[PDB]
């Protein structure tokens, strides 16, 4: 049988609002690691690939490796009938007919379950596992959005820019151009202000700014994100969940 | 100078009439020496309204007639929105009138806020004056009850409420699954705005709307308790205490 | 060249938000003694005047008399990628093709540079000078934006009616009649409630309550409001800026 229970059931909200927009119907994949999924864009152009260790969850069973098909668009609606300070238990048999989500509050002696029926679906390999990548740049997450939702605002593409000097963002559209540069800073003793990058090799992309702000959504998970850009390989975008993570690949338009 | 009614704080006609606005648009408001009442059916005539703000809440409080003044709502909440939740509220009328009119006093502020809503003739008749014997009564936070429905009308437009001598289940189903909320009676001992009481005869089981119980909930500004009743042959009970009286909705079950 | 510094973009920020419903293309007429602007509602009924004084600048460098043709909806876009208290950068040269924007961060130590297209907008007039005004009303903005808002919903027109003794706002329309009077008091104990009146002559007039809620978009730019009336002349509604004003011109209804 599988038990997962979260003593927050904030964090697994947070985590499906990120995704929901990309991905609807996925595979949740449990085994003794913990609960992991990895589905790619309806346009077949993003690949969501998070993992939620078994560290993570107190307790955490999972018997069998199985395969969770869930509507996510299902998931969402019943996961806002949790409180983010709920005790949240998910729940399973030795089938895959439904699974059950509990939600107990620490101070009401309330109890909430649903039972969501599963889905039949087929995963994929998928590519690609452990690139190594010529540029990593980590920033607030904060900022990162705000970057992106800014230029969004001007057009629908971004081009990153990394030296060894820092990270550009640039911009142009009909309005005009829009740019926004990063200084790579260390010990502050502020982490809030931090921006570390380590370069291999000069880095020139072109993304999709309508992806990477469907990224930022991830933003209440991590107040870091992390960047990894070479050509021939798909951006990384990867923001930590502590005892886990969820990582955005985009493949360049460039 | 027929009709005067002096409210302490704005607020409460504010909150009744917006947790109302949304099923009824033109009622009557009945007012005689006993004090102002409203007894008016949802547009599709499923769920029943009733007010009662007993005289004894106003001061002053004066009506010389038993008089019906048919007001349209969407009208009353635009006015209502010009007054602030602690303003002084004074409704006036004179004798069969064409208008009623509505004062804002701030206490702060030297501001004074003068409104006249033309009125409609709209008839009631009958009415009851039910007095029904309830199987089921629930004392829960109101603040509770909503969230139950308002969790519940995401996975389904019904939901069953199974009252039994070991507590109170929501339970629901849908095309996406089936949710389940149950209330266990509890006393408090510790914060009292947590309690949950169950006075019960027999077990009853029902189907309601969720669409008409969420919309119910807008009355949750109005109490931090709210009571269900609850019996077979009958329709649900949401009552809100207003403090001298009540809000009540009826919603009949679906067969 | 043209170089304008402000402290916070905040101000700026407001300041577009306040005209952006009423005017969209317009100029921003710069020279030494800071950047004005004057134009007319889309609907040729309401005249905007704004003035950003030098003074208020720091730095601040116009070498030549320059028109500065900008899309308010454009700038909203821009201005909307600017926190409230980043450091704003105007900069131009004298032959205008563009007008460069720069946000400085205190903070996250973040520089957004943004070059807006400029457009061909033809400068012209009208006079205004020195009027001389019979009743001049001082009051919280945020009340009198309520007022209009309260009264909007019950009619299209508002009767400003002032004495010395205080200020009454009529309405009428299908619902019924709406009227609201505050009395002329001053109390530093609570300085925003207070209301002053100078009047040389009782004043009654009647406007459209359609723009008289359009100029309160302007309230999050100062606490107080000024009301200027006259039967001869149109009512005067400004907003100090601090360093300067922001003014809205509205003719009274015969």
Redesign the interface.
Known sequence: MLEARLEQASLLKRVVDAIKDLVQDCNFDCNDSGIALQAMDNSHVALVSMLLKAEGFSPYRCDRNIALGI?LV?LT??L??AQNEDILTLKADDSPD?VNLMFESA???????????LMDIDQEHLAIPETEYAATVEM?SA?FQ??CR??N??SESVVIEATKEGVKFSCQG??????????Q?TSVDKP??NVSIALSEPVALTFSLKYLVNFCKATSLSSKVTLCLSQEVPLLVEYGLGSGHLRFYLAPKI
Chains 1, 3 share one sequence.
């Open positions: 509507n299902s609606k019943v806002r009938a439904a101070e009401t002696d309330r109890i909430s379950e649903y039972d969501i029926k607030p900022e705000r970057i800014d230029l605002a001007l009909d309005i005009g151009s829009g740019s926004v540069t990063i200084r800073h809030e202000q």
